[PDB]
RNA sequence: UUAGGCGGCCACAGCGGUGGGGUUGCCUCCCGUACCCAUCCCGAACACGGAAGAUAAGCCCACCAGCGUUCCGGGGAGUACUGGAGUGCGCGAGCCUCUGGGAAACCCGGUUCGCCGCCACC
RNA sequence: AGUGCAAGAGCAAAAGAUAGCUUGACAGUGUUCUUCCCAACGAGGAACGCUGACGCGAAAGCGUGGUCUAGCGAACCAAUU
RNA sequence: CCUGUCAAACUCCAAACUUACAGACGCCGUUUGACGCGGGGAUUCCGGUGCGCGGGGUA
């Protein structure tokens, strides 16, 4: 199914576990990237950031980071760097998949609700931003138009 | 400062805790004043399903009464030291349990006014030991 | 002291915003009135400020548009400075001016009805659909730009 | 509304903020009324008794005499005029 | 204490000194309360009417203040109790005050209590009481005879020093007497 | 208020901590069970009777801000949100301008370790 | 925590627990709100009185069933006081 | 300790705003009698659209 069906947030906020049931489990396989043994302690800071408030189903956001970290192999397998996607699927989707009676519809995912200008992703290397390159493919698998901000790094 | 501060003997609780009795009798004798009944909370698989229910008795003894038994209980206790509570308390053996505290307690258990004993004018198990142990035996 | 001028019609607008319009004594487009400056006053001009001009005139002006489109409680009567004299506490259409530019008086206690009705603006204004800082020719403006607009309203 | 009882939608107005919470000063249930002051309507989630319908929480009325230690406010529920019994606890002098 | 959600009982709730719950009831009457409270030397009765910024004591009587009427004697006992009541009564009565209810505060209920003795005294003062004459002592007691049998029983005076050797239920009489006629402050 | 009783507001008063205070007078702890009364067992408590001792508790007084709370300055912020208006923008979601209102988190610095009423009292 | 049962709300020297005692889950008749916001409409419900008789308590007082909002039924006919 | 996120059936907070009563101005009423009271006669109980706020629904 197409993200013209949910990627709106016009509906209201849906999240509520104790009283929904057989939610799908998220596709996201990690949130943490690189090496999560070391903290923020480099150079170079970019982050991704989504430029229109939309819902990003975790559909795109598995695709978009496996994507954007598969890539991010231009550093290798245990490369120094570390990849965070801040955004977690918390808002719960329906589909009523009888005609329109009896519609409430019954959840067939989760997606992310992310605000215009929030950083859905951020990464951090050390003068060697092959990083800019894995968001402009990760930002092509989500709905919006992106902006790839820099921020601690005046070594341009 | 001090004979307000000095430890003193507030009851000693001989209590047995069997599991349904016959047995207050002895603890009239041990000690010289009738037992009480200790009836029992909730529902359980040693066949206690009871509420309310004789399980035990206990003997609260306070003053000539409480010394008079200790003048036999202590002898045929040994123990000392981690053995006794964090406010200079200690149980041992059938239990005989000793609580102990200094004169102005009566503060935090009357009705008007109450309060609690600060933690300065509370009891240390330190304290504790030195009081009793200068009372016929020995410590650890 | 604010001159209040409609200078949008009542098709569509709010009942209450329309009320408030009446309360202050001008019933039709184009109908001016003169209102002090309190807190009172102040939110009821507030509440009507997208459908009128609003704003403190000139002393001159002001006479200019007493004499032009003054009227009494009843009649045709031209309210000029022999009528001023001749029946209220002042002696010319300057005296009266003054008295409501300094709000000691009003239209009504002066025996004259609370409302000027204006003409259409000669020359037009500068539209009803944006406000002054934008062009437009709603909501406060300036001495100046009061007077340019009740002057072609003359 | 799912339900049409008294207390359906009073969770809010019917509820004490957390430090508000257990009984209530005796002073103002013992408070004393005379006809014609006027009273504010408010009920105390503290106090059970002498309430009034919730969909009265809020008015302002007249007192009019009282029933046993309750007091008779007079209220205009719209356009209609109403009485309400309720005790001091559930009122406040206005001003 | 622990956080914003925290709940703080009132201050005299705190301080263990006011039954709130007793309070209430006890307003219920719109009657002024007559206030009997003990010390472990003295007892004092009051007249508390309810008031804008708290209670008002319109009238009230100290164990102590007895002497300054021709008492010898201890003040913690039941003949001190009930003459103070009776004094604070009388000074009630100056104050136009004619009813009252008994609150005891934190005490208990118990028959023959100086509370109780409190509320004789202010009862046959004039001040029109609730009460229930059975739970009062039996008026020897009052007198203070249970003490003097108790010195009975001497080898060793009761009174250290103080006033008498076999103690005096008649020195009580003696101050009722007084109370009940003319004398300052009353 | 050189120590008390009854309260109002019900944390500005909570939590924790320091220092000081009783020679006759007050509150206490304290001492003690013939009585009224009392413990499903204990004068522990409750109740009654009393001063040999003490200021160590409590309590009263002076003070500390580490935590919780109240209010204030500056910053966040005229941001977020919003009542009224628009032939302003945008494929749209939505945004913008004019007008009238206007926050929360958090940081930094102050404030707060109760206030007040009635009665009694070297 | 507990308070019979949904959910939300109330409650700590208690509205909870224990003990003891008691039958107010009483008869009569109303006021008011609700049912039905506003704004007419029955049964039902609730709050708050009074009259009478009672329970408990030292007493103020509390008890018009269970902390509050669900647990309800017309005329005709029968049986019953 | 540090670090990453949320709530129609969460709330330590908290608007704009809506709302009870009162006073003030305004407007209105006392020959155009308002507010209100009593009675006669209805029609009406298929609605629709824009804008704001919505809930459902891919729409
Ligand atoms: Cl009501
Ligand atoms: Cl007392
Ligand atoms: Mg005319
Ligand atoms: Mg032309
Ligand atoms: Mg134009
Ligand atoms: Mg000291
Ligand atoms: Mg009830
Ligand atoms: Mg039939
Ligand atoms: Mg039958
Ligand atoms: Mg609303
Ligand atoms: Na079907
Ligand atoms: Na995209
Ligand atoms: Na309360
Ligand atoms: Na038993
Ligand atoms: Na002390
Ligand atoms: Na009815």
Redesign the interface.
Known sequence: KPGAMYRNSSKPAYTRREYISGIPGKKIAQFDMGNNGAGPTYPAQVELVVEKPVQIRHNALEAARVAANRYVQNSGAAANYKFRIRKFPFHVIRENKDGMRAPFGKPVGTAARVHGANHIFIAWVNPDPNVEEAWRRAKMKVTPTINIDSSPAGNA | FHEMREPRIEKVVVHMGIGHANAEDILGEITGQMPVRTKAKRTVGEFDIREGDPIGAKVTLRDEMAEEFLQTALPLAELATSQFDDTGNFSFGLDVTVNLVRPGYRVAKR?????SIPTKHRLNPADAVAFIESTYDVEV | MHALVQLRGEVNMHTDIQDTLEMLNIHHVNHCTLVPETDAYRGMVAKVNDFVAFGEPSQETLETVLATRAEPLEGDADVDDEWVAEHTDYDDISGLAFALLSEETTLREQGLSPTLRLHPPRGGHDGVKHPVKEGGQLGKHDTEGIDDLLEAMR | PSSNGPLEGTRGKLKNK??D???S??QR??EEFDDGEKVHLKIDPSVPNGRFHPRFDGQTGTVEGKQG?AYKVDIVDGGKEKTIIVTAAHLRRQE | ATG???????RRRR???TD??Q??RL??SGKPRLVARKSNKHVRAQLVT?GPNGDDTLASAHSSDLAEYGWEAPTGNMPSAYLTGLLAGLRAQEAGVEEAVLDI????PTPGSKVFAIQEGAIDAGLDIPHNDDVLADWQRTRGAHIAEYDEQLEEPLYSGDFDAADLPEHFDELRETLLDGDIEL
């Open positions: 009705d008007k006014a109450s309060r | 957390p430090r919470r257990g009984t000063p005796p249930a013992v230690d | 914003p959600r925290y709940k703080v009982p009132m301080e263990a000194r709130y719950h309070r209430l307003l219920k309810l505060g934190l005490n208990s």
